Amino acid sequence: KETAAAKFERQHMDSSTSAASSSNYCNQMMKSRNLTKDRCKPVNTFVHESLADVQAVCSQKNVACKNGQTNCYQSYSTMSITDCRETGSSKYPNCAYKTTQANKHIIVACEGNPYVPVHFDASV
């Protein structure tokens, strides 16, 4: 079965490109990462940095999570990310997304032993 850590990697990691993310990037990525299978996931961020660099965020700046939990961490450096947001006209199963590339600090929640990212909270 898929671990929480593995799900984070599937949903949020894309180390292969520096940013490139064509205007088609989210339409393609959201489907293939299985985020459009049961419904159109409304909002999802992919991070274009090495796995070790994203894992390292769990030992960086501790900040409150949006839900009030205390186990969120903000990257000291900006990171290459792509935000995917479902369009107004998108209708399941034809999930359609706007693709927006940015360099921002990421905030992730970390859990477990080993202590690793399990949830993408925000970018700032």
Ligand X SMILES: O=c1ccn([C@@H]2O[C@H](COP(=O)(O)OP(=O)(O)O)[C@@H](O)[C@H]2O)c(=O)[nH]1
Decide if residue 43 touches ligand X (CB under 6 A): yes
15/71 with CB nearer ligand X: 71
Give yes or no: 105 in active site: no
- Ligand-binding annotation for 45, yes or no, is yes
Among 9, 49, 86, 121, binds ligand X (CB under 6 A): 121
Helix H or strand E encompassing 109: strand 106-111
Evaluate whether 122 touches 107 at the Cβ level (below 8 Å): yes
**80 sits near ligand X (criterion: CB under 6 A):** no
Are 15 and 46 contacting, i.e. CB atoms less than 8 angstroms apart?
no
Give the Cβ contact number of residue 31 at 10 Å.
15
Instruction: Please indicate if the annotation marks 47 as binding a ligand.
Output: no
Q: For ligand X, how many residues bind (rule: CB under 6 A)?
A: 18
